[PDB]
Enzyme design. Structure first.
Site, short mmCIF file in Angstrom:
data_model
loop_
_atom_site.label_atom_id
_atom_site.label_comp_id
_atom_site.label_asym_id
_atom_site.label_seq_id
_atom_site.Cartn_x
_atom_site.Cartn_y
_atom_site.Cartn_z
N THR A 1 0.33 -9.62 6.97
CA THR A 1 0.83 -10.72 7.77
C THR A 1 2.33 -11.07 7.51
N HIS B 1 -11.64 -11.02 9.85
CA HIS B 1 -12.05 -10.70 8.48
C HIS B 1 -13.56 -10.92 8.25
N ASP C 1 1.08 -9.56 14.82
CA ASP C 1 1.67 -9.01 13.59
C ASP C 1 1.01 -7.67 13.16
N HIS C 2 -0.27 -7.49 13.49
CA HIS C 2 -1.05 -6.30 13.04
C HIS C 2 -2.39 -6.39 13.70
N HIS D 1 -7.10 -5.30 7.14
CA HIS D 1 -5.93 -4.62 7.70
C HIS D 1 -4.97 -4.34 6.56
N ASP E 1 17.93 12.81 -0.48
CA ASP E 1 17.78 11.37 -0.69
C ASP E 1 17.20 11.13 -2.07
N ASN F 1 17.98 8.93 -4.35
CA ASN F 1 17.74 7.52 -4.67
C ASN F 1 16.80 6.83 -3.67
N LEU G 1 18.82 6.91 3.34
CA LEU G 1 20.22 7.15 3.79
C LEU G 1 20.77 8.42 3.13
N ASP H 1 22.54 11.05 0.93
CA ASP H 1 23.22 10.99 -0.38
C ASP H 1 24.64 11.57 -0.31
C1 LIG Z 1 18.08 -1.15 7.26
O1 LIG Z 1 19.10 -2.13 7.57
C2 LIG Z 1 19.69 -2.76 6.45
C3 LIG Z 1 20.73 -3.81 6.85
O2 LIG Z 1 21.79 -3.18 7.58
C4 LIG Z 1 20.31 -1.71 5.50
O3 LIG Z 1 20.44 -2.35 4.26
C5 LIG Z 1 21.81 -2.45 3.83
O4 LIG Z 1 22.27 -1.26 3.20
C6 LIG Z 1 23.63 -1.32 2.72
C7 LIG Z 1 24.00 -0.04 1.99
O5 LIG Z 1 22.97 0.23 1.06
C8 LIG Z 1 23.81 -2.50 1.74
O6 LIG Z 1 25.18 -2.60 1.38
C9 LIG Z 1 25.38 -2.99 -0.01
O7 LIG Z 1 25.47 -4.40 -0.15
C10 LIG Z 1 25.88 -4.93 -1.41
C11 LIG Z 1 25.92 -6.46 -1.31
O8 LIG Z 1 24.58 -6.90 -1.45
C12 LIG Z 1 24.33 -8.30 -1.18
O9 LIG Z 1 24.93 -8.84 0.02
C13 LIG Z 1 24.34 -8.43 1.27
C14 LIG Z 1 25.13 -8.99 2.47
O10 LIG Z 1 25.07 -10.41 2.57
C15 LIG Z 1 22.84 -8.79 1.27
O11 LIG Z 1 22.21 -8.47 2.49
C16 LIG Z 1 22.12 -8.09 0.10
O12 LIG Z 1 20.72 -8.38 0.18
C17 LIG Z 1 19.88 -7.57 -0.68
O13 LIG Z 1 19.73 -8.09 -2.00
C18 LIG Z 1 19.04 -9.35 -2.10
C19 LIG Z 1 18.85 -9.69 -3.57
O14 LIG Z 1 20.09 -9.54 -4.19
C20 LIG Z 1 17.68 -9.37 -1.39
O15 LIG Z 1 17.29 -10.71 -1.19
C21 LIG Z 1 17.65 -8.63 -0.04
O16 LIG Z 1 16.29 -8.41 0.36
C22 LIG Z 1 18.47 -7.32 -0.08
O17 LIG Z 1 17.74 -6.40 -0.90
C23 LIG Z 1 17.73 -5.04 -0.42
O18 LIG Z 1 18.97 -4.34 -0.54
C24 LIG Z 1 19.45 -4.07 -1.86
C25 LIG Z 1 20.85 -3.42 -1.83
O19 LIG Z 1 21.81 -4.34 -1.32
C26 LIG Z 1 18.40 -3.23 -2.62
O20 LIG Z 1 18.77 -3.00 -3.96
C27 LIG Z 1 17.04 -3.95 -2.59
O21 LIG Z 1 16.05 -3.14 -3.19
C28 LIG Z 1 16.60 -4.33 -1.18
O22 LIG Z 1 16.16 -3.18 -0.49
C29 LIG Z 1 22.80 -8.54 -1.21
O23 LIG Z 1 22.56 -9.91 -1.44
C30 LIG Z 1 27.24 -4.35 -1.84
O24 LIG Z 1 27.61 -4.87 -3.10
C31 LIG Z 1 27.18 -2.82 -1.85
O25 LIG Z 1 28.46 -2.26 -2.17
C32 LIG Z 1 28.46 -1.28 -3.25
O26 LIG Z 1 27.90 0.00 -2.91
C33 LIG Z 1 28.60 0.65 -1.83
C34 LIG Z 1 27.87 1.89 -1.29
O27 LIG Z 1 27.06 2.50 -2.27
C35 LIG Z 1 30.07 0.90 -2.19
O28 LIG Z 1 30.76 1.44 -1.08
C36 LIG Z 1 30.72 -0.42 -2.65
O29 LIG Z 1 32.07 -0.24 -2.99
C37 LIG Z 1 29.90 -1.08 -3.78
O30 LIG Z 1 29.94 -0.28 -4.97
C38 LIG Z 1 30.07 -1.04 -6.20
O31 LIG Z 1 28.91 -1.78 -6.56
C39 LIG Z 1 27.80 -0.99 -6.97
C40 LIG Z 1 26.50 -1.81 -7.02
O32 LIG Z 1 26.70 -2.99 -7.77
C41 LIG Z 1 28.15 -0.29 -8.29
O33 LIG Z 1 27.07 0.48 -8.79
C42 LIG Z 1 29.37 0.61 -8.08
O34 LIG Z 1 29.74 1.18 -9.33
C43 LIG Z 1 30.52 -0.14 -7.38
O35 LIG Z 1 31.22 -0.93 -8.33
C44 LIG Z 1 26.64 -2.28 -0.51
O36 LIG Z 1 27.62 -2.37 0.51
C45 LIG Z 1 23.27 -3.79 2.38
O37 LIG Z 1 23.32 -4.86 1.46
C46 LIG Z 1 21.83 -3.59 2.82
N1 LIG Z 1 21.29 -4.86 3.32
C47 LIG Z 1 20.01 -5.27 3.26
C48 LIG Z 1 19.69 -6.63 3.82
O38 LIG Z 1 19.08 -4.62 2.78
C49 LIG Z 1 19.35 -0.55 5.25
O39 LIG Z 1 20.06 0.48 4.58
C50 LIG Z 1 18.76 0.01 6.54
N2 LIG Z 1 17.78 1.02 6.24
C51 LIG Z 1 17.76 2.22 6.82
C52 LIG Z 1 16.65 3.16 6.33
O40 LIG Z 1 18.59 2.56 7.69
C1 LIG Z 2 6.79 -16.07 14.83
C2 LIG Z 2 6.94 -16.20 13.30
C3 LIG Z 2 6.08 -17.02 12.61
C4 LIG Z 2 6.21 -17.17 11.22
O1 LIG Z 2 5.39 -17.97 10.44
C5 LIG Z 2 4.27 -18.58 11.14
C6 LIG Z 2 3.34 -19.27 10.18
N1 LIG Z 2 3.18 -20.63 10.18
N2 LIG Z 2 2.24 -20.90 9.21
C7 LIG Z 2 1.76 -19.78 8.59
C8 LIG Z 2 0.81 -19.62 7.56
C9 LIG Z 2 0.52 -18.30 7.16
C10 LIG Z 2 1.21 -17.17 7.76
C11 LIG Z 2 2.16 -17.35 8.78
C12 LIG Z 2 2.46 -18.67 9.20
C13 LIG Z 2 7.20 -16.51 10.51
C14 LIG Z 2 7.31 -16.71 9.04
C15 LIG Z 2 7.92 -15.49 8.35
C16 LIG Z 2 8.18 -17.94 8.80
C17 LIG Z 2 8.09 -15.69 11.21
C18 LIG Z 2 7.93 -15.51 12.60
CL1 LIG Z 2 9.11 -14.49 13.51
CA LIG Z 3 20.10 8.25 -0.34
ZN LIG Z 4 -5.77 -10.88 7.78
#
Ligand SMILES: *[C@@H]1O[C@H](CO)[C@@H](O[C@@H]2O[C@H](CO)[C@@H](O[C@@H]3O[C@H](CO[C@H]4O[C@H](CO)[C@@H](O)[C@H](O[C@H]5O[C@H](CO)[C@@H](O)[C@H](O)[C@@H]5O[C@H]5O[C@H](CO)[C@@H](O)[C@H](O)[C@@H]5O)[C@@H]4O)[C@@H](O)[C@H](O[C@H]4O[C@H](CO)[C@@H](O)[C@H](O)[C@@H]4O[C@H]4O[C@H](CO)[C@@H](O)[C@H](O)[C@@H]4O)[C@@H]3O)[C@H](O)[C@H]2NC(C)=O)[C@H](O)[C@H]1NC(C)=O
Ligand SMILES: Cc1cc(OCc2n[nH]c3ccccc23)c(C(C)C)cc1Cl
Ligand SMILES: [Ca+2]
Ligand SMILES: [Zn+2]
Ligand SMILES: [Cl-]
Ligand SMILES: [K+]
Ligand code: NA
EC number: 3.1.4.39
Length: 804
Positions: free
Chosen positions: A157, A263, A306-307, A418, A681, A683, A687, A689
């Site tokens: 969900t 369920h 959702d599913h 599910h 890939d 790591n 994406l 490498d």
């Molecule tokens: C699907 O779509 C999404 C969104 O477009 C794609 O994900 C993006 O991929 C980008 C490239 O990997 C990535 O860019 C990096 O961002 C770093 C900044 O990170 C923070 O800020 C952003 C923007 O606001 C934010 O979204 C991030 O959010 C993540 O982290 C928080 C917790 O901290 C989580 O709440 C959140 O869920 C999210 O987690 C996910 O992503 C992270 C990676 O960011 C994973 O580790 C998690 O497991 C999880 O999946 C962050 O809050 C930025 O710092 C990076 O820059 C470094 O690296 C690049 C390239 O490698 C380099 O060019 C830079 O110079 C820099 O290098 C230096 O730092 C390194 C690391 O510290 C260090 O090792 C080096 O030595 C260097 O000094 C980078 O640009 C982007 O953040 C994510 N976004 C999201 C939301 O996931 C995704 O790829 C797509 N998927 C497919 C399959 O296509």
């Molecule tokens: C359309 C939608 C509904 C929604 O949540 C609905 C919800 N209300 N109460 C719940 C209790 C259990 C599970 C779900 C819910 C969310 C959450 C990620 C914020 C996202 C989106 Cl797009």
């Molecule tokens: Ca890779």
């Molecule tokens: Zn269920």
């Protein structure tokens, strides 16, 4: 303290600074509501329906909703008011009329969007429950609908609703399960509890935040459990009557049904008819309420699940205690998937490799399969997050996994569940879009829920945050408001090398029996090396390289390639096999033939000696020798520039694909074009490498080892036309095969390849788009089809399920 009042603040849209008591929707969830919340904001008196006697009543503020003359102006009539008291008709009874333009009251800047979400709403309910859901059936037949919508994995969900909200895979948004452990937080997320409310779990940027940041106001998305559905509907309708500067433009409703009942009773239990009835009536309430406010030809409505839901009972449980001896040393996240980690990190005597081995092909009918997360099908995008445990169990549909039998009787309750693999038919869910911006009476092909965020952003005039949708791949859903997608620019241009090296310049340790040497066919041999047959083997133009690199186009009679001087192998190899084409064998005298390529320097070539010396690694070919057009053209297939590293175990798979399957597909599909290549890939982030991320090379060389191999196989959708002369829409299937040194994944691998290979490949089916992320390439650059249609084609997944 909760000492203030909700008078005038019921379901207020801004969250009040603590500790001033709250009157917003979430207050109940935090135990922070003002003392008079229930009294003022959750009135129930007299029910939810106007009756004949209530008409023109004296307003009474204690009533749940109102039938008095002033209620339209106050925005608080019962939804059936105009029907009962003004002789008006239910919206469901009205014929449907095309909505060519938004028909909105003065002051509405844009059509509002209302997302009506339903938990556990399996795709086939649309047909099987059609007789009891007349409002939903009108939305579906009058609007735009898909036969089904594909959820993300796991098919739970929160991961799916948060994917709808953000356009992100769960690995990227962070909600990777209905239950999760974060090893950095040392904290667990559950359906129960207050932990789930901490914003540290929820990454990405959800629709409501995207909206607010760009000046479009959002209603609440999370509804507290105790607020009944009629009151959620009435709250949305009341918000819609707010003044222009305060009124939101985006709204969501959520129902816990039909999941809650599914369920208990299974997906088609007789008990399931009534929840479907009740959801339909709620949809009726909303549509009647919109039509009362003259908004029924103004608002865009999305009805989305959702599913789905599968039949699952206690007796279909696999127990880890029946496979492992150290079952008390592990923690299992159980159910329709499994995730395993050590019970303690202060125990380095914990071996994932022995655990996997103890769980692999141990029982003839085993109803799960263990995987290291990096080996899961790439289509699931389920690895790149610290909350996903290294060991994953993919569970068969209809089954559960549990640690020990005591977890089942000391935790039958249930008949439905599910969470399984997202290609499973029973997990598919629904999409209907209805309103001025959607098309009229239109069926669209099934698509993935990751794509909806971009469409909702377009619906609201918003710029989407970076996400995993492919913007424009769903343009065909919309009448107007279409994004205008454009192809990315090529970053690297190829070299087109000629003959530059003499044979004796090479010292690659390769041999070939090739010296058995006519101007009729000597002019022709140079013709083929310059690109004469290139229109045959490269049908959709050359893929564009979207990163900075150094590479060469190499032409041959039977195939063209893009050869990377940095990775020492092709990034892509393209070839067409017609229906008529012949399969032949590798002549005896050419079994071990590898030939230097006189267009490519010794210094940018592979060498045979590294393969001789690496006792684990062998090699294969991207264009297969078996499919050469003539004994003479076959010599090209043995060029060093066509070779790639392959584990012997992997060669079993690859050779069966190239020798048997390519031909069978050509026969079935009236010719196929094939593009094959390596993927790196290491790591596991989905994406491409960079060169400095590679962790394995062929022993004592700079030849990098692929983690995966892909193929994209394209033909004409109208299979009366051959692949190479197709005038219309295309048809594609693709795969990303893991490059593994054993076939432990395939339990029947000891038998002939014809009993297991194709089954493996099916499991590893892929979108073209998944391959584009993994390669930094962009395919289908030169076709006669529109770019939006090509984007749809690139997001297509061939699932191999039967018809829904
Ligand atoms: C699907 O779509 C999404 C969104 O477009 C794609 O994900 C993006 O991929 C980008 C490239 O990997 C990535 O860019 C990096 O961002 C770093 C900044 O990170 C923070 O800020 C952003 C923007 O606001 C934010 O979204 C991030 O959010 C993540 O982290 C928080 C917790 O901290 C989580 O709440 C959140 O869920 C999210 O987690 C996910 O992503 C992270 C990676 O960011 C994973 O580790 C998690 O497991 C999880 O999946 C962050 O809050 C930025 O710092 C990076 O820059 C470094 O690296 C690049 C390239 O490698 C380099 O060019 C830079 O110079 C820099 O290098 C230096 O730092 C390194 C690391 O510290 C260090 O090792 C080096 O030595 C260097 O000094 C980078 O640009 C982007 O953040 C994510 N976004 C999201 C939301 O996931 C995704 O790829 C797509 N998927 C497919 C399959 O296509
Ligand atoms: C359309 C939608 C509904 C929604 O949540 C609905 C919800 N209300 N109460 C719940 C209790 C259990 C599970 C779900 C819910 C969310 C959450 C990620 C914020 C996202 C989106 Cl797009
Ligand atoms: Ca890779
Ligand atoms: Zn269920
Ligand atoms: Cl889970
Ligand atoms: K070897
Ligand atoms: Na095996």
């Amino acid at each position: 303290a909760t000492s203030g009042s909700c008078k005038g603040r019921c379901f207020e849209l801004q969250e009040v600074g603590p500790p001033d008591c709250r009157c917003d929707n979430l207050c109940k969830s935090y135990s922070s509501c003002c003392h008079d919340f229930d009294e003022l904001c959750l009135k129930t008196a007299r029910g939810w329906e106007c009756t004949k006697d209530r008409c023109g009543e004296v307003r009474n503020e204690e009533n749940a909703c109102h039938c008095s003359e002033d209620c339209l102006s106050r925005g608080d009539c019962c939804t059936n008011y105009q029907v009962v008291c003004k002789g008006e008709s239910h919206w469901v009874d009205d014929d449907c009329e095309e909505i060519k333009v938004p028909e909105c009251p003065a002051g509405f800047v844009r059509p509002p969007l209302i997302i009506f979400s339903v938990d556990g709403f399996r795709a086939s309910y649309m047909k099987k429950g059609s007789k009891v859901m007349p409002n939903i059936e009108k939305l579906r037949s009058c609007g735009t609908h898909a036969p089904y919508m594909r959820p993300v994995y796991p098919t739970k969900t929160f991961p799916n609703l948060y994917t709808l909200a953000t356009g992100l895979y769960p690995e990227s948004h962070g909600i990777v399960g209905n239950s999760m452990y974060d090893p950095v937080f040392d904290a667990s997320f559950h359906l129960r509890g207050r932990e789930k409310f901490n914003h540290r779990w929820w990454g990405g940027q959800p629709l409501w935040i995207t909206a607010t940041k760009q000046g479009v106001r959002a209603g609440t998305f999370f509804w507290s459990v105790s607020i009944p559905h009629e009151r959620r509907i009435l709250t949305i309708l009341q918000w819609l009557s707010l003044p222009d500067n305060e009124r939101p433009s985006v709204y969501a409703f959520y129902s816990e049904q039909p999941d809650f009942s599914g369920h208990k009773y299974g997906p088609f239990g007789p008990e399931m008819t009534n929840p479907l009835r009740e959801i339909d009536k709620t949809v009726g309430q909303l549509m009647d309420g919109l039509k009362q406010l003259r908004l029924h030809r103004c608002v865009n409505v999305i009805f989305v699940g959702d599913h789905g839901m599968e039949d699952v009972t206690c007796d279909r449980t696999e127990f880890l205690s029946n496979y492992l001896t150290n079952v008390d040393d592990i923690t299992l996240v159980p159910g329709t998937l499994g995730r395993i980690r050590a019970k303690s990190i202060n125990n380095s005597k914990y071996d994932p490799k022995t655990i996997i081995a103890a769980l692999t092909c141990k029982k003839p009918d085993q109803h799960f399969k263990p995987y290291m997360k990096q080996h899961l099908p790439k289509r699931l995008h389920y690895a790149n997050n610290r909350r996903i445990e290294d060991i994953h169990l993919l569970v068969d549909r209809r089954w559960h996994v549990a640690r020990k039998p005591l977890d089942v009787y000391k935790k039958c309750f249930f008949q439905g569940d599910h969470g399984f693999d997202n290609k499973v038919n029973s997990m598919q869910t629904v999409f209907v879009g209805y309103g001025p911006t959607f098309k009229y009476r239109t069926k669209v092909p099934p698509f993935e829920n990751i794509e909806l965020y971009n469409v909702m952003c377009d619906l609201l005039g918003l710029k989407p945050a970076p996400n995993n949708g492919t913007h424009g791949s769903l343009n065909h859903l919309l009448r107007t408001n279409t994004f205008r997608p454009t192809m990315p620019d090529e970053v690297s241009r190829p070299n087109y090398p000629g003959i530059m090296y003499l044979q004796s310049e090479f010292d690659l340790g390769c041999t070939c029996d090739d010296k058995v040497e006519n101007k009729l066919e000597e002019l022709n041999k140079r013709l083929h090396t310059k690109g004469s047959t290139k229109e045959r083997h490269l049908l959709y133009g050359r893929p564009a390289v979207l990163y900075r690199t150094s590479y060469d186009i190499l032409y041959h009679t039977d195939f063209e390639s893009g050869y990377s001087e940095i990775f020492l192998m092709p990034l892509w190899t393209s070839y067409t096999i017609s229906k008529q084409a012949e399969v032949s064998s590798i002549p005896e005298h050419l079994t071990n033939c590898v030939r230097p390529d006189v267009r490519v320097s010794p210094g940018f070539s592979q060498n045979c000696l590294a393969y001789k010396n690496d006792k684990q690694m062998s090699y294969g070919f991207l264009f297969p020798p078996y499919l050469s057009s003539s004994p003479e053209a076959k010599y090209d297939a043995f060029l060093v520039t066509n070779m790639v590293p392959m584990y012997p175990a992997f060669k079993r798979v690859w050779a069966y694909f190239q020798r048997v399957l390519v031909k069978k597909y050509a026969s079935e599909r009236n010719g196929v074009n094939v593009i094959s290549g390596p993927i790196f890939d290491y790591n596991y982030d989905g994406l491409r490498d960079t060169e400095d991320e590679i962790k394995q090379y062929v022993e004592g060389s700079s030849i990098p080892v692929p983690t995966h191999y892909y193929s994209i196989i394209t033909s004409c959708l109208d299979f009366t036309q051959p692949a190479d002369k197709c005038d219309g829409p295309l048809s594609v299937s693709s795969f990303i095969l893991p490059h593994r040194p054993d076939n432990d994944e395939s339990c029947n691998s000891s038998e002939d390849e014809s009993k297991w290979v194709e089954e493996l490949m099916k499991m590893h089916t892929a979108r073209v788009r998944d391959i584009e992320h993994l390669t930094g390439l962009d395919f289908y650059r030169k076709t006669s089809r529109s770019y939006s249609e090509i984007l749809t084609l690139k997001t297509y997944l061939h699932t191999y399920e039967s018809e829904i």
